[PDB]
Amino acid sequence: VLTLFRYSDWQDKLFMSLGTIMAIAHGSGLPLMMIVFGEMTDKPGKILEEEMTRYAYYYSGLGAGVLVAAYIQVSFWTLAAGRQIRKIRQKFFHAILRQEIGWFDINDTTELNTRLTDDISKISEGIGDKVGMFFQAVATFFAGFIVGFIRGWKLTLVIMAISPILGLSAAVWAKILSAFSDKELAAYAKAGAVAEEALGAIRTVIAFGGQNKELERYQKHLENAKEIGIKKAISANISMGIAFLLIYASYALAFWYGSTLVISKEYTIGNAMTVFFSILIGAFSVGQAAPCIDAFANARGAAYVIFDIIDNNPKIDSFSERGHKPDSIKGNLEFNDVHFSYPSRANVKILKGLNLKVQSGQTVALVGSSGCGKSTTVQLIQRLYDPDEGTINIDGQDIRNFNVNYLREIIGVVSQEPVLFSTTIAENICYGRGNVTMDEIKKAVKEANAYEFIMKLPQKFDTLVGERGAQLSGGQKQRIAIARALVRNPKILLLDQATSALDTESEAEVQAALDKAREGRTTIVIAHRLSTVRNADVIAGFEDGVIVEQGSHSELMKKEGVYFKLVNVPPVSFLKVLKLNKTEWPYFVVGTVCAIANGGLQPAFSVIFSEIIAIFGPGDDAVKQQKCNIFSLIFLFLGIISFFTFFLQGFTFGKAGEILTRRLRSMAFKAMLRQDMSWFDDHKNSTGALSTRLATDAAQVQGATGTRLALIAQNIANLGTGIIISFIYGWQLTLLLLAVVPIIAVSGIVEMKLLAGNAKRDKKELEAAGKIATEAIENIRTVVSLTQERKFESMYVEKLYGPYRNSVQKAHIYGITFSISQAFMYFSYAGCFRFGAYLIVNGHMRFRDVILVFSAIVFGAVALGHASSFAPDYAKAKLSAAHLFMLFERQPLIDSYSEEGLKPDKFEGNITFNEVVFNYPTRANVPVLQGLSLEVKKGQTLALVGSSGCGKSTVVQLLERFYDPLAGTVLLDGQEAKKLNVQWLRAQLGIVSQEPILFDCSIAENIAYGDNSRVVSQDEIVSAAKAANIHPFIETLPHKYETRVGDKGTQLSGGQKQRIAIARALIRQPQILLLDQATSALDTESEKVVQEALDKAREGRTCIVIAHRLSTIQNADLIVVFQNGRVK
């Protein structure tokens, strides 16, 4: 209960304590004034005027006191909530970056950004101003009790006898509501994980036609969250129904008991009515604080998962400082019987006792088959996992003894398929070490041979690399990764196929630079080519995860081992949002009629009190008991009907809001899966930004469209009925009562114009924080391997500073507006007493009519606080609704959901390019293609040959129809590709990407994703697996086709996911194959087995090959050489 306030500082405790005592001082005033008011109620034309004027002095002073008490009440709670929400946001991201990679494999980490955004929003709604308004209502209730015990003590015990039942019911239903809040929250987090997985790899979802599959996977969780939110609303309104049932039933009991006392004259008329009126003010106030109770229960439910992640502790601690930092390390490295298994597949033994010995100054070279443990050996050097039954030594001393940061900073890796970050080129090379000068950057870039194209691009070292490097080619991204590793100047260099996507001349220059550089660093080389493996002093060969083969080139060539075999924004009206749920108009009708019939009843008690005071007059005393029994039956039946009407309005409004939220979330994701690749290449649209938008916009709409509308319709009916009753009984005073309406209206106008202005900047800056959070979570291998986690926490905090200041300004603006609203509501009483004195002494109205109007106005003074509490939600609801509708009304150029276009029945695999000129929209000044002419007949094989960065993957993107050419014609089988239906077009193609990526599902589903719109059978999956040469490994695994591949294929090796990408292409039986270096992480045996099945499958269809081999280019039918983006 106080774990929400576990992170409260001393200033936070001071703000919450002063806000608590000022809210206790603020609420207790209304009932306590009744003791001085109730002494003239039981009642020459000057003494009454003096009493009225004196009470006007009291009320004006009370209003002045309320002006500063309500200000401090709101402002200090909102300042404290802003400060501790800032530090919870910092500590949760620090706790995510602290954990080790064994935690990132066995847990769900695409769920964390959605969990972050939506839970911190729920906690900010929960621990803020709602708690202060709750204390205000509690102080009002107990001040009514104090007034009751001063005036008449036998009346207040009968009503105090029910308050533990109200506390019991509120605690029970708040505990149930916190449980359902956690259950609903988990479902929305699963849906956000589906969306963030689908938007991260968007090129494969577009190219394989998987929009409907991802949309159905999203809607499967939206339906569960809907069905939890409905019964959440059921419990949340059984609570208020039981509360008001107890209120009116106990008031019936107390009124029947007070009947006998007033008739037997033990009390007078004045002592009973003050007790009744003060207790009804308090009892209505505690009932209105029930939404604040529900909001606190929701925050308590959200905090469960966030606090645990902070509590969890890693065995390999990244931030700790408890290890040796020796001054001089010669690069000796040695294994001693290393046994290892990954924690996600624990029962598959991988290293079975390895004995490697690397001397300081020489390099080794790891050869072997695919899937034997080479990059596992590389991952155990930098201590990402601990081995099960072994030890790894550097210069005689164990790696478990070193400081983890010092180890990971003295060694420098190159990953297999390297991943850049979504910042500039010089920023990636600065992420390399951390404090680099430009001399170091330019020398390392020349040493990695990346200098010519960086000089060639405009804004040379400032070109924004796309998300994961997607705005660069495959041989430019890898040279930037080589330069990134070289700026560190490591003592131990790890090269895991660093030249896998470079052509032969650049491989020669890179290997000459790396060979010239070595003086005192050890190097581990995993070689793509076995022609440069001969320049190694030691060669290690893996056979079932051990070393059976070690020595020099001729030493292992005369040995007959494994190496021998290898060598041989427009605003939107809110009725436009409520135009979407036209279908449940009976829900809004029943909710609005019950809200009117519930809000009207609070001011009607003045007329009931007038009839009570008139019915206790001089009589025969046998009739007044029989009339007062009729009044008590009326209060009992009013209690039963109030139970039914409160339940109906709340449940009815809540169900309609859940339906609208489900429709808005699915419409937003369906309309986000629709835009073309230029919308995703826009630098504002990262997947972190796009996954914060789906969690913010519909949630901000739901927060103002839920049961809050039922409560505000109730409060507006309350304020209306007060004015109507006032006009009937005295029309002269009611004009002054309505005279404040211009001032409260202008204050509402000014706070709406300021809260709509700062919610804009809040929404603008939370996406820029969520971008950093998502890239640092989803590239956690490279983050941990480079030790830039301190820098990413620093960046997240300095992007998180902004909404703190926005919360400060929101606190002051909303506090001033709530303050002057409550003060100008309490000055109306002083104006009413003075002007009513004037009217009574001139003879217009009467004293009981002045009492009647005053009594009717007190309940509206209750309702204004909740209307002002609703007012800061409507601004962010309007803003997020404008953003949702501009997303819904955006229409792309290449429309993926269109049903019109030519859909020919028979397709001959003929393609033709007639002088295609194309520039990318992000860098639209550089020419990529400069008029491209190539024609491929049926059954031919086009081979694309060129240097690195010539436009070989651009033609695959143009044939896949992501992009439109500027001036040129892409035509297929005679007819132009713009005329064809784009889903038909993308279904006729079969594509293997350059660095392929998978999904976080099973191998059977990743292979069956290759052809949608039909249930692909298990026999077809097994046949494509046998053709792609993966079925021996799949049969070896303990789960055969149900081993869950990790996020983007990280729980497999390079060759295995290359091979599942080839099977995913080949399962659809395409008409044309697009193979963009389809065999680049495979060895010679696997590549020659794959190529035979590809050759027997290519009989009768066309294919386009982009492969850097002399074996697959030479047997091709056409050979195309690129120079300056043209064909030669």
Ligand SMILES: Nc1ncnc2c1ncn2[C@@H]1O[C@H](COP(=O)(O)OP(=O)(O)OP(=O)(O)O)[C@@H](O)[C@H]1O
């Ligand atoms: N994160 C992981 N979780 C579970 N198993 C894994 C993980 N990474 C790899 N494996 C498994 O470990 C075995 C060894 O794969 P490994 O990554 O060592 O291949 P490799 O021969 O080093 O080639 P590469 O250099 O492409 O990684 C594979 O069978 C793979 O299925």
Ligand SMILES: Nc1ncnc2c1ncn2[C@@H]1O[C@H](COP(=O)(O)OP(=O)(O)OP(=O)(O)O)[C@@H](O)[C@H]1O
């Ligand atoms: N999404 C993009 N936005 C802007 N420019 C891009 C984008 N993708 C690629 N480029 C640019 O296009 C040029 C060539 O792209 P492409 O990836 O087709 O070359 P490539 O021949 O595939 O290279 P490699 O053979 O090394 O894989 C590169 O200079 C690259 O900077």
Ligand SMILES: CC(C)CCC[C@@H](C)[C@H]1CC[C@H]2[C@@H]3CC=C4C[C@@H](O)CC[C@]4(C)[C@H]3CC[C@]12C
């Ligand atoms: C008499 C009543 C109306 C006024 C009560 C005075 C209160 C509201 C004033 C007096 C002293 C003030 C504190 C003095 C010191 C600081 C440290 C500053 O870094 C944060 C604000 C904070 C914590 C102030 C908060 C407001 C404060 C506590």
Ligand SMILES: CC(C)CCC[C@@H](C)[C@H]1CC[C@H]2[C@@H]3CC=C4C[C@@H](O)CC[C@]4(C)[C@H]3CC[C@]12C
């Ligand atoms: C700064 C504001 C918010 C604090 C509210 C202060 C409360 C506790 C004060 C404000 C007005 C005060 C009342 C003013 C008049 C009198 C009449 C006297 O015969 C009995 C006490 C009584 C009824 C006071 C009780 C205490 C009181 C209600």
Ligand SMILES: CC(C)CCC[C@@H](C)[C@H]1CC[C@H]2[C@@H]3CC=C4C[C@@H](O)CC[C@]4(C)[C@H]3CC[C@]12C
């Ligand atoms: C009637 C008058 C004298 C009452 C005094 C008003 C005092 C209590 C209010 C008005 C201005 C307020 C300060 C305005 C600015 C901030 C900055 C914020 O980061 C810390 C709280 C702090 C410092 C507020 C503390 C409380 C404060 C000092």
Ligand SMILES: CC(C)CCC[C@@H](C)[C@H]1CC[C@H]2[C@@H]3CC=C4C[C@@H](O)CC[C@]4(C)[C@H]3CC[C@]12C
């Ligand atoms: C929730 C609980 C605490 C509230 C229970 C309230 C009960 C005790 C009160 C509410 C209405 C009251 C009844 C109101 C009217 C009359 C009619 C009279 O001819 C007999 C007594 C009788 C029948 C009262 C008996 C006591 C009574 C039933």
Ligand SMILES: CC(C)CCC[C@@H](C)[C@H]1CC[C@H]2[C@@H]3CC=C4C[C@@H](O)CC[C@]4(C)[C@H]3CC[C@]12C
């Ligand atoms: C729900 C809101 C909008 C309508 C409020 C009207 C009802 C609930 C209130 C307002 C005036 C009240 C009436 C005032 C006068 C009397 C005369 C008495 O001999 C019987 C009870 C009776 C008839 C009261 C019953 C309830 C009553 C009719």
Ligand SMILES: CC(C)CCC[C@@H](C)[C@H]1CC[C@H]2[C@@H]3CC=C4C[C@@H](O)CC[C@]4(C)[C@H]3CC[C@]12C
């Ligand atoms: C008994 C008296 C005080 C009740 C007064 C009712 C007042 C508080 C309510 C009733 C209708 C409300 C207005 C309804 C419409 C809007 C448009 C909104 O974009 C700005 C606020 C504004 C202008 C509201 C201001 C506050 C308002 C005028």
Ligand SMILES: CC(C)CCC[C@@H](C)[C@H]1CC[C@H]2[C@@H]3CC=C4C[C@@H](O)CC[C@]4(C)[C@H]3CC[C@]12C
């Ligand atoms: C809620 C606010 C806006 C209402 C305004 C309150 C003040 C300014 C109003 C309300 C009652 C009014 C007073 C009512 C009666 C009289 C007696 C008359 O012989 C002189 C004017 C005088 C004294 C009025 C002056 C203005 C007055 C004091």
Ligand SMILES: CC(C)CCC[C@@H](C)[C@H]1CC[C@H]2[C@@H]3CC=C4C[C@@H](O)CC[C@]4(C)[C@H]3CC[C@]12C
């Ligand atoms: C603190 C600021 C916002 C207050 C602004 C409103 C002030 C100027 C107005 C509104 C209500 C007015 C009070 C209403 C009633 C009367 C009774 C009369 O016999 C003496 C003047 C007196 C007591 C008025 C004094 C001035 C007053 C308090």
Ligand SMILES: [Mg+2]
């Ligand atoms: Mg390429």
